Design a protein around this ligand. Structure first.
Ligand SMILES: Nc1ncnc2c1ncn2[C@@H]1O[C@H](COP(=O)(O)OP(=O)(O)OP(O)(O)=S)[C@@H](O)[C@H]1O
Ligand SMILES: [Mg+2]
Lengths: 380, 187, 209, 240
C-alpha cells in the first residue's frame, strides 16, 4: 500500500490498524518489525502494493531501499531489487524509487521491487539519458548572503557557542526565504533531544544519527544522504545540506576505516582524509539547473588535539568559513608559518618592490548588519 | 462597516483577558493552598511556580492585545465620526481656514507641510480656548452605544498588569513554555 | 566497587541499590549493567520516573572493553573501537519521554588517574551528557567540601528547568563568582550559605547587598 | 587601482606603511590611475618635507599640479602651505567641482604642527600638545563629502614604526578616527583587525559569561568573493 503514510504515522493508531487487520503480536518489537508483521499479513492477503525509498547497492549484487523517516537504518523494511532491474535501468545508489513492488514468497522474506512508477519524480526512461556528475565539468552555467548558490560553506565553533540555534535560524531562513529550494539537515552522533527538536522545528526533512548507534551507522547514513543529494540534483532541483558535524563524521570514518599501513598525526589514515573531500566536490558546483550547497559545522577546542588536527586539515577546503572564536580566526586569516620565516628572514628581502604583491584593501563596507569592516588579500 | 467587527474583536479580547485572569487566580490560590499544606511535594511546587510564570506571561500578552484592539476601535470610530462631520462642514472649515488651504493646492512639499503645521497649531489654540466652558461632551449618533460598551478608557487592571515588558528572548522562551503547557493540557 | 563501600551504599540509601565488586569478573559487571538498564527501560515504559546513579562509567567502559571480542581497530591506550559502543547506549538511554515518565542517569567519571584508558574514555564521553559537574582535588586539599568547580561546571538548556526570576538571580551569582578563584569562590559560597537558611534567603541576601 | 574602486567618492581614507615599503611608486600608480580612469576629477598631489628629487619626479610624472614642500625649509612653510591648500580646496568646493588630494604625509604634518604649535600646557605623554591634535582633526575632518553637488575626497599617507615614539600616538588616534586604512606591514594588520587591547580586556575576565545573543554577536565571515585578480577573500567582523 502507501508505505509513506503507513510508516510515517505514529504507532498510536498504527497499533489499532494492526489489531483491526488481524494481527495479535504487536506493540512488542521495534517500529520497523511491526511493519514487517504487516508485510507478512498482507502477503497472506492480496492487493497491489507501492514501494518507495532511496535505493542503495550492496557489494554482492542485491540492493535495498532506505527510508527517510527511519533515520536511514537497515532493517526488515527493505525493498529487494534484482540485479536485472539494476542493470536495465543502470541504477545507482541514491535514486528515489516510488514504484510498484511485489509481496514476498519462498526465498525472499520482504518486499521486492517489480517496476518503478517514477525515478525521483521523473519518468524512468526519460531520466535514462542524464549526465553524471563527474563527466559534467563544474562550471556556473539568509542562505544567499552567507553562501549563495553552488558554493561550499563551513562554520567552525567551540562548544556552548550557539551552534544549534545558528543552524535552527539558518533552517528557518531557508524555509521561508527559499521555499522552492529543498531543505535537508544531517546530524551526526547528536543527542536524541536535539534530533527530536530539529525534526519538530524545521520544515524540511531531517535525517539524523545518534551517538548510541555505532560509527558504521554514521558511515552508511552519510553515504546514503550524499547519494540522495546527488540524485536529487541530477533532475535539476536545488538541495541544501545542513551537516553537523564534520568533525564527528571524520572521527567515525577514522575509527571504522581499515588502516592503510601508514599513520598521520591524530591516528588518522589517508583514506579517512580523502573521503570528506568527496562530499565537498560533489557539492563543489552545479552547471545548468539546481544546486548542491553544503553548510557543515566543525568543533574546536574540545579538549582533544585530533579535532584541531582535522580542523587544520580542513582549513582551506571550504570557500566560506564562519568563525565564532578569535583564536582560530586569527590563525586561519593570518597564518604564522610565513611569519615564522619572515621574522628571521626580514620580509625575505628578495626585491625592493616585492612589497607590492602583499596589499590589504581595508574598506569599511555597508550591509544590513550596518557598517561592517572588510579585508582583502592582494597576494599576487 | 468595520467598526462592528472591531467592537466584536475588542469584546472577545476582553473575554480572553478576563478568563486568563480567572485561571491565573485559580492557579495562584491552589499554589497557596498547597504551600499551606505540610506535604513534601517539592516538584509539585516547582511546576506550580512554572505554571504561575506561564499564566502571568499569557495574561500580559492578552492584556496587550486587548489594549491594541481598544486603541484600534477608538481610532476607527474617531476616523468615521471625523469623516461624517467633515462631509457636512468641509466648506465651512475651508472658508474659515482658507489661506493655507489653497496654498496647499500649488505649493511645494516644504510649503505644504509648513502650512499643515501652522494650521494644526492654530486649531490647537482653538481647541484649548474652546474647552474653557467644558460642557458635558456627548457621543455620536450611532456609535454612542459602541463607545459606551468599549468605554472611555480600558480597565485599570488591564493596564497595570502590562507594566513589565519582555525582550524577544523572554517572549520566545515563554512562547515555547506555553506551547509545552498546551501540549500537556491536550494529553 | 570495594565491598565496604558496597555495604555502606546498602545501608545509606532508601531505594534499592545494586553493586558488583572488583573481585567478580567483567562479565558480571556487564550483565549487572544490562539488568539495570533493562529494568529501568521496562519501568519507564509504564510512565515511571526512574533515576540511576552510576559509579562509575569509566569502570563499566573498561569492563565492556575487556569483555567484548576484538575487532582489530584499537585506539591509543588499548581501547577497542567498538568496545565503547555498548556503554554509550547505556548512557544514551537517559531521556524525557513525552508520553509519560522519564529516565535520568547521573554517571560519574574518573579523571587524572594516571591511565590512558580512563583519559580516552573521558574524551569519548566528554561532549555527550547535557548536564555536567567537575570536582577538583586541589579544592579538596583545603578540605572545604563539596570540592565543586563552580565556574567550570554548569547545565545546558537550564531555562526549561527553572522559573524566570531565579534564573537571572543565578546569572548574577555566576557573574559575581566568575572573577574569583575557584577555591576562593567555593569558600565564599560556603560562608554565604552558612549564615543563611534557604536558597531563597541566600538569593535575597545577595541581591540586597 | 581606480580611486573609485579603493577610495570611492566623497569619503576619506588612509594608507599606512613602514619605511622601505614602496610608498612613492604606489602613490605614482594611484596618480595615473586617477588621471586615466577619472580625468574629470581635479588631480592634486601634495608632498611635505621630503627629498627634492622625489618632488621633481612626482611633479614630472603626473599631469596635475603638485604643490610640494621639500625638506630644506623649516616647518612654518609646511604649516602655511597646509592652510593654503585647504583653503583652495574649500574654494574649489564652492566652485562646484570634484577634487582628489594625494597628501604625503599626515604624520609629517602632524608632528610638524607638534613642533611648531605654541605651548599651551595641554601636553601629554611625549610632549604632544592638544592644539597640535585638534588642528589636525580640523584639517582631517574638513575632508567631508559635499552633499549639494560633486564630491571631494582625499587619500592619506602615514608612516609607521620609524624608530621613534611620536608617530604611533597620532597613528592610534587616527585608528580611533580612521574611516578606511590600507596596511602593508605584518603586525599592525593583526593589531587593528584583532585589537590586542580588546583581547587583553576580554582575557582579564577570561571567557566572559555573555548572556544570550551577546555571545553570538561576535561573528567572523570569510567569503571568497569573485575578484578580477581571481578569488580574493573578504573577511568581515559581523557584530549584532
Ligand atoms: N539570540 C539568542 N536568543 C536566545 N538565547 C540565546 C541567544 N544566543 C544565545 N542564547 C543562549 O545561548 C545558550 C547556549 O546556546 P546553545 O546553542 O545551546 O550553544 P551550542 O553552540 O548549541 O553548544 P552545544 O550545541 O550545546 S555543545 C542557550 O541556552 C540560549 O539561551
Ligand atoms: Mg546546540
Amino acid at each position: 500500500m502507501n508505505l509513506t503514510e503507513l510508516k510515517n504515522t505514529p504507532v498510536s493508531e498504527l497499533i489499532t490498524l494492526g489489531e483491526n487487520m488481524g494481527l495479535e503480536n504487536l506493540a512488542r518489537m521495534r517500529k520497523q518489525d511491526i511493519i514487517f508483521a504487516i508485510l507478512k499479513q498482507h502477503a497472506k492477503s492480496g492487493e497491489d502494493i507501492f514501494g518507495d525509498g532511496v535505493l542503495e547497492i550492496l557489494q554482492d549484487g542485491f540492493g535495498f531501499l532506505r527510508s527517510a523517516d527511519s533515520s536511514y537504518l537497515a532493517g526488515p523494511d527493505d525493498i529487494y531489487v534484482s540485479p536485472s532491474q539494476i542493470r536495465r535501468f543502470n541504477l545507482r545508489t541514491g535514486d528515489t524509487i516510488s514504484g510498484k513492488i511485489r509481496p514476498p514468497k519462498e526465498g525472499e522474506r520482504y518486499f521486492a521491487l517489480l517496476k518503478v512508477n517514477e525515478v525521483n519524480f521523473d519518468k524512468p526512461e526519460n531520466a535514462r539519458n542524464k549526465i553524471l556528475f563527474e563527466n559534467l565539468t563544474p562550471l556556473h552555467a539568509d542562505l544567499a548572503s552567507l553562501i549563495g548558490r553552488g558554493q561550499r560553506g563551513l562554520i567552525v565553533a567551540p562548544p556552548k557557542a550557539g551552534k544549534t540555534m545558528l543552524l535552527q535560524n539558518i533552517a528557518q531562513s531557508i524555509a521561508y526565504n527559499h521555499p522552492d529550494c529543498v531543505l535537508m539537515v544531517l546530524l551526526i552522533d547528536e543527542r536524541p533531544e536535539e534530533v527530536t527538536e530539529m525534526q519538530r522545528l524545521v520544515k524540511g526533512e531531517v535525517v539524523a544519527s545518534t551517538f548510541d548507534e555505532p560509527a558504521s551507522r554514521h558511515v552508511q547514513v552519510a553515504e546514503m544522504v550524499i547519494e540522495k543529494a546527488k540524485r536529487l540534483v541530477e533532475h535539476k532541483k536545488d538541495v541544501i545540506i545542513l551537516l553537523d558535524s564534520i568533525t564527528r563524521l571524520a572521527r567515525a570514518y577514522n575509527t571504522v576505516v581499515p588502516a592503510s599501513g601508514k599513520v598521520l598525526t591524530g591516528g588518522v589514515d589517508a583514506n579517512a582524509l580523502h573521503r570528506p573531500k568527496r562530499f565537498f566536490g560533489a557539492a563543489r558546483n552545479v552547471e545548468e539547473g539546481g544546486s548542491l550547497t553544503i553548510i557543515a559545522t566543525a568543533l574546536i577546542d574540545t579538549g582533544s588535539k585530533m579535532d584541531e588536527v582535522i580542523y587544520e586539515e580542513f582549513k582551506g577546503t571550504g570557500n566560506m568559513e564562519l568563525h565564532l572564536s578569535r583564536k582560530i580566526a586569527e590563525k586561519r586569516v593570518f597564518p604564522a608559518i610565513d611569519y615564522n620565516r619572515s621574522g628571521t628572514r626580514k620580509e625575505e628581502l628578495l626585491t625592493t618592490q616585492e612589497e607590492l604583491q602583499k596589499m590589504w584593501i581595508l574598506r569599511k563596507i555597508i550591509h544590513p548588519m550596518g557598517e561592517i569592516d572588510a579585508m582583502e588579500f592582494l597576494i599576487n | 462597516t468595520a467598526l462592528q467587527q472591531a467592537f466584536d474583536t475588542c469584546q472577545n479580547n476582553k473575554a480572553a483577558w478576563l478568563q486568563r485572569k480567572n485561571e491565573l487566580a485559580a492557579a495562584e490560590q491552589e499554589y497557596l493552598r498547597l504551600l499551606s499544606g505540610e506535604g513534601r511535594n517539592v516538584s509539585r511546587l516547582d511546576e506550580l511556580r512554572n505554571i504561575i510564570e506561564v499564566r502571568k506571561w499569557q495574561v500580559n500578552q492578552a492584556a496587550g492585545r486587548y489594549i491594541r484592539s481598544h486603541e484600534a476601535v477608538q481610532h476607527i470610530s474617531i476616523r468615521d465620526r471625523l469623516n461624517d462631520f467633515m462631509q457636512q462642514h468641509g466648506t465651512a472649515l475651508a472658508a474659515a481656514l482658507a489661506p493655507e488651504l489653497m496654498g496647499y493646492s500649488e505649493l511645494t512639499a516644504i510649503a505644504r507641510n509648513c502650512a499643515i503645521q501652522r494650521a494644526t497649531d492654530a486649531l490647537r489654540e482653538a481647541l484649548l480656548s474652546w474647552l474653557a466652558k467644558g460642557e458635558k461632551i456627548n457621543y455620536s449618533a450611532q456609535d454612542s452605544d459602541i463607545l459606551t460598551t468599549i468605554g472611555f478608557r480600558p480597565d485599570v487592571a488591564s493596564v497595570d498588569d502590562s507594566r513589565e515588558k519582555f525582550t524577544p528572548a523572554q517572549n520566545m522562551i515563554f512562547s515555547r513554555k506555553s506551547a509545552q503547557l498546551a501540549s500537556r493540557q491536550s494529553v | 566497587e570495594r565491598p565496604e563501600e558496597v555495604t555502606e551504599m546498602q545501608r545509606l540509601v532508601k531505594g534499592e541499590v545494586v553493586a558488583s565488586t572488583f573481585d567478580e569478573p567483567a562479565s558480571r559487571h556487564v550483565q549487572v549493567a544490562e539488568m539495570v538498564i533493562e529494568k529501568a527501560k521496562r519501568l519507564v515504559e509504564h510512565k515511571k520516573d526512574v533515576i540511576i546513579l552510576l559509579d562509575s562509567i569509566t569502570r563499566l567502559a573498561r569492563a565492556y572493553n575487556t569483555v567484548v571480542p576484538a575487532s582489530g581497530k584499537v585506539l591509543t591506550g588499548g581501547v577497542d573501537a567498538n568496545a565503547l559502543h555498548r556503554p554509550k547506549r547505556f548512557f544514551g538511554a537517559a531521556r524525557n519521554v513525552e508520553e509519560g515518565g522519564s529516565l535520568t542517569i547521573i554517571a560519574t567519571a574518573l579523571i587524572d588517574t594516571g591511565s590512558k584508558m580512563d583519559e580516552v574514555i573521558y574524551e569519548e564521553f566528554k561532549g555527550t551528557g547535557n548536564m555536567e559537574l567537575h570536582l577538583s582535588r586541589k579544592i579538596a586539599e583545603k578540605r572545604v567540601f563539596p570540592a565543586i568547580d563552580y565556574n567550570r561546571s554548569g547545565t545546558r538548556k537550564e531555562e526549561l528547568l527553572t522559573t524566570q526570576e531565579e534564573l537571572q538571580k543565578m546569572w548574577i551569582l555566576r557573574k559575581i563568582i566568575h572573577p574569583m578563584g575557584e577555591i576562593d569562590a567555593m569558600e565564599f559560597l560556603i560562608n554565604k550559605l552558612a549564615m543563611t537558611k534557604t536558597n531563597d534567603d541566600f538569593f535575597e541576601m545577595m541581591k540586597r547587598s
